[PDB]
Amino acid sequence: PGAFPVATNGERFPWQELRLPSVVIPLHYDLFVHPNLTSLDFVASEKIEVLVSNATQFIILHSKDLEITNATLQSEEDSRYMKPGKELKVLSYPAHEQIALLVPEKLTPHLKYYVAMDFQAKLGDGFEGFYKSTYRTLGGETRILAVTDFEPTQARMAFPCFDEPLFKANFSIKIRRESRHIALSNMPKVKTIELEGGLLEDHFETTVKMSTYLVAYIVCDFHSLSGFTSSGVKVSIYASPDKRNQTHYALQASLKLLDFYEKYFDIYYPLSKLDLIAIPDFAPGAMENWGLITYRETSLLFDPKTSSASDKLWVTRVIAHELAHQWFGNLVTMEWWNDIWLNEGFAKYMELIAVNATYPELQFDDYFLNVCFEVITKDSLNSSRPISKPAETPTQIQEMFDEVSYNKGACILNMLKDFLGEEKFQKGIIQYLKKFSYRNAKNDDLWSSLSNSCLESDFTSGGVCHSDKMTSNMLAFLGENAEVKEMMTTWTLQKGIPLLVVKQDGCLRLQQERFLQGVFQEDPEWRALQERYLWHIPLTYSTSSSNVIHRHILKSKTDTLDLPEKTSWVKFNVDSNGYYIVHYEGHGWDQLITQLNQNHTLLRPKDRVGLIHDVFQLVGAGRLTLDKALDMTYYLQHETSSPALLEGLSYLESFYHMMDRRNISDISENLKRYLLQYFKPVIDRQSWSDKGSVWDRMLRSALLKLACDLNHAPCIQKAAELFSQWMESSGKLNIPTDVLKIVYSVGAQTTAGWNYLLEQYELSMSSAEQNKILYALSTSKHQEKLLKLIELGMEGKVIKTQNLAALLHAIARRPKGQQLAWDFVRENWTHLLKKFDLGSYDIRMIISGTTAHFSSKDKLQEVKLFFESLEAQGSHLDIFQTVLETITKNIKWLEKNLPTLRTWLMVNTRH
Ligand SMILES: *[C@@H]1O[C@H](CO)[C@@H](O[C@@H]2O[C@H](CO)[C@@H](O[C@@H]3O[C@H](CO)[C@@H](O)[C@H](O[C@H]4O[C@H](CO)[C@@H](O)[C@H](O)[C@@H]4O)[C@@H]3O)[C@H](O)[C@H]2NC(C)=O)[C@H](O)[C@H]1NC(C)=O
């Protein structure tokens, strides 16, 4: 009783382990919450119907920053705790966010009890728990609401509970309100009862089985727009009253999307209603609470005068994502946070297939490869992780919501689908979701259901699946099933991403390596980090002679294939559907670049964006010289697939901003010239309108921002005119949404426009328009102004605090601000902790937002120092090492190819 931890009051806490005990299993929660929005208080009470599997003396729960007032225990099966039951003694042990209740006599197996507590707290001033949010009306009034955000482990800041995702229970929620407000929660309201003083009591329908983190309840002012799905779900979009205009497309798109998901999964959405509500103060982008999905206004609200088409594509993708959570994450929750990718990676993947299903016009298929490329940069560093990986503390759990669980999870799924086909892939996910509905799954569970997918409706006679035959196919289906489950599991447990090397003989030797950046092949530690890595990569390839795609699994470090027609070139990873990079040896890279400059149309357009990415990443690998990747961008002047064109330019624009930050004004002036002159035709075709289709529109904003970011004399002139008209018309005129952001940042370049822009930020009713405005403000060249912006965001009264993170990142992007942001962060690191969690995305982004672009040996030392200073104070985050590898990789890239870039650009001048 000594090595045991000590509760406050000084006692021995019965448990001392980070997890909870699987002996008292919660079945049903009766939750009564009564918040006061004038006091900014809440009073609440709860009765948990629990089951005991094993005899115990002590009950262990989660509670945090909650004052428990009263603790009792009753039963209708165990006589001893007969009505009105017995009082419990409460021991709190905050270090593990656990609360221990002791009973006067041990309890009985297979007998259900009722645990009751009365507790109270203040509404949070953060972005978690049961917190306080605030919005501005059109009149200029300020109103309050109370809102919940619990994922992953802040449910316990609102009510005591078994805050782990496997402890699934039903929830019955009563909420007390003034007549001024309404109350929402996960399920439909069945009753509202008049109370003595004048207050009302909302009783909500008791929920289905679900994890704690999804519970939701809201008290507020809002207005709604309703519609019904083909399955008869009442969908409603909620926002502050003056913003109900902007709420119309969210309703149209969510109806179409809930329809798509029900038919695709062959599973009806189980609740009667579904609510989407735009929360003014919202840290995450959105959250998927079952039947009560919360968003930032930017995620959900669309206004047609001030939102761009790209804005529309973003709003429609979050709705897509959140709605995919109702099955992946709510209908089937992962067993533990270690397999969080089971929720997020699958949800992210269904954004693709559903947005492509219901809004092809938005041309989202063409931008999905960007999801893969974004994680590939981090999976090329040794600081990455395998998809599934242990996590125990609340900060580690938060860390798990990254590019790995989300993007990598989705790219390995999309790779696996190409392998099996939509028909086999769909039927596999329907079997998964039906089988695990209302309970949890672990990583291994999924691969079994996807591996044993049945291609069609189970052909009873004589089938390959169920009800009955024994054939040679049957030994191959059973045999290919365990081929796929073996394959996927190594992608799941191996950090990193493979590099397929292809040497074309007379008739193809294949080698497999762990792709790595920074580190070169000759380097001392390159052979040390290639240890033990091997993937079952499902390859693809097509050749110069025929469009036929050949598919060849590879399960060894070396292999070789025989080419029949011995054609001009071979291209592996067709449409880049596979999570790997191909490097060609000896006039095979040269062969493909030859094609791109003659008929680039003899390679399908995903192959072209695939090569463009692979080419530059191999320059990062050192396996290629920069002259070759720049030699490929030559063809881009004939390029017609807008995705390949913008992928290409993006790299070139990358370089310019890199040079500009380091003051290298020879190269970032020829870079300026090479873009403006070589791509002058495509730039000058663009409107200053909203006139085209979605890739026309999306391509117009892209190029015009490019030209105005390079101070192209004409485009800066047209933008400043448009800004003046808008300012001199007191907003009576309108600016096309595609150039809205460009115009604002042009205007921001004088104090007059900047000050007007800030003053008209406070009065806008479109949070898209604000988001664009704040960017424009962040492009000021006066450090006097940037500092104001950052201080306004620290304050949080004008520029809301859910923007201080992305603001800092914006300021840091541009040269005049990359320091001031760095200085600020190190000078107020402790203040920034009192506003955000150490594992929050707001901190991970504040950190790399201001450091990860550094590319000099001298800056790295500062950062390593600052990070050490932090780890010294007990703060550790994986993001630390990731930045350092990134900063390091930047230094090596400059050291190895800066002369080549400089020389390549001068050479182009001559022709
Ligand atoms: C959160 O707390 C706020 C206060 O911080 C609270 O608002 C207050 O509610 C009380 C209770 O309803 C109000 O006090 C009453 O006001 C009415 C007039 O509106 C008076 O008539 C009351 O006195 C009589 O009431 C009875 C009849 O109903 C009589 O039988 C009795 O004998 C009295 O003669 C009493 O003064 C108070 O006005 C508000 N505060 C305001 C409006 O500023 C709010 O209700 C709480 N919210 C929740 C959800 O709990």
Ligand SMILES: *[C@@H]1O[C@H](CO)[C@@H](O[C@@H]2O[C@H](CO)[C@@H](O[C@@H]3O[C@H](CO[C@H]4O[C@H](CO)[C@@H](O)[C@H](O)[C@@H]4O)[C@@H](O)[C@H](O)[C@@H]3O)[C@H](O)[C@H]2NC(C)=O)[C@H](O)[C@H]1NC(C)=O
């Ligand atoms: C906790 O959540 C659980 C879900 O995870 C709930 O379990 C569900 O409970 C319901 C009710 O017992 C079961 O519903 C079944 O539905 C059929 C069809 O109902 C028929 O009768 C009605 C009445 O007129 C009619 O309207 C219908 O159309 C049908 O004609 C019933 O016949 C069954 O007996 C059964 O009631 C679900 O199957 C069940 N699902 C699961 C996964 O367990 C549980 O109820 C929740 N607990 C609490 C206390 O609410």
Ligand SMILES: NC(=O)[C@H](Cc1ccccc1)NC(=O)[C@H](Cc1cc(-c2ccccc2O)no1)CP(=O)(O)[C@@H](N)CCc1ccccc1
């Ligand atoms: N801007 C972002 O990418 C933020 C970054 C972030 C912030 C906080 C946590 C995790 C990630 N993503 C979200 O807020 C997420 C994921 C996501 C991606 C997209 C997206 C939509 C359209 C187009 C591109 C997109 O990427 N929309 O949402 C909503 P979730 O459904 O998984 C929910 N259960 C998250 C729960 C959570 C809350 C607090 C801590 C930890 C986890």
Ligand SMILES: *[C@@H]1O[C@H](CO)[C@@H](O[C@@H]2O[C@H](CO)[C@@H](O[C@@H]3O[C@H](CO)[C@@H](O)[C@H](O)[C@@H]3O)[C@H](O)[C@H]2NC(C)=O)[C@H](O)[C@H]1NC(C)=O
């Ligand atoms: C780069 O290669 C492509 C091949 O994919 C070239 O386009 C193709 O050119 C041939 C030759 O004209 C077309 O063949 C067909 O000939 C008959 C004979 O009259 C005619 O009736 C057909 O309609 C067609 O012209 C082939 O179809 C054509 N493909 C397409 C999609 O038009 C391309 O022209 C080459 N590069 C350049 C710069 O031309």
Ligand SMILES: *[C@@H]1O[C@H](CO)[C@@H](O[C@@H]2O[C@H](CO)[C@@H](O)[C@H](O)[C@H]2NC(C)=O)[C@H](O)[C@H]1NC(C)=O
């Ligand atoms: C995106 O949507 C399109 C919808 O047409 C898909 O393309 C079709 O896919 C079906 C299979 O469901 C094929 O039989 C058709 O021939 C395709 N038509 C066209 C015009 O391409 C496309 O596959 C979808 N992409 C994803 C990833 O789901």
Ligand SMILES: *[C@@H]1O[C@H](CO)[C@@H](O)[C@H](O)[C@H]1NC(C)=O
């Ligand atoms: C507790 O559960 C375990 C599970 O292994 C079981 O063996 C045991 O009999 C149960 N009861 C007690 C008192 O441990």
Ligand SMILES: *[C@@H]1O[C@H](CO)[C@@H](O)[C@H](O)[C@H]1NC(C)=O
């Ligand atoms: C326990 O709850 C009852 C009911 O509200 C209350 O009267 C009592 O004060 C509470 N706690 C005690 C007496 O310790």
Ligand SMILES: *[C@@H]1O[C@H](CO)[C@@H](O)[C@H](O)[C@H]1NC(C)=O
């Ligand atoms: C809200 O909707 C109606 C729809 O016709 C429109 O006439 C009204 O002006 C709108 N108000 C705002 C502020 O957009």
Ligand SMILES: *[C@@H]1O[C@H](CO)[C@@H](O)[C@H](O)[C@H]1NC(C)=O
């Ligand atoms: C790479 O990561 C491994 C695994 O965490 C670690 O053992 C090693 O120190 C790291 N090395 C480098 C050079 O990053």
Ligand SMILES: [Zn+2]
């Ligand atoms: Zn998600």
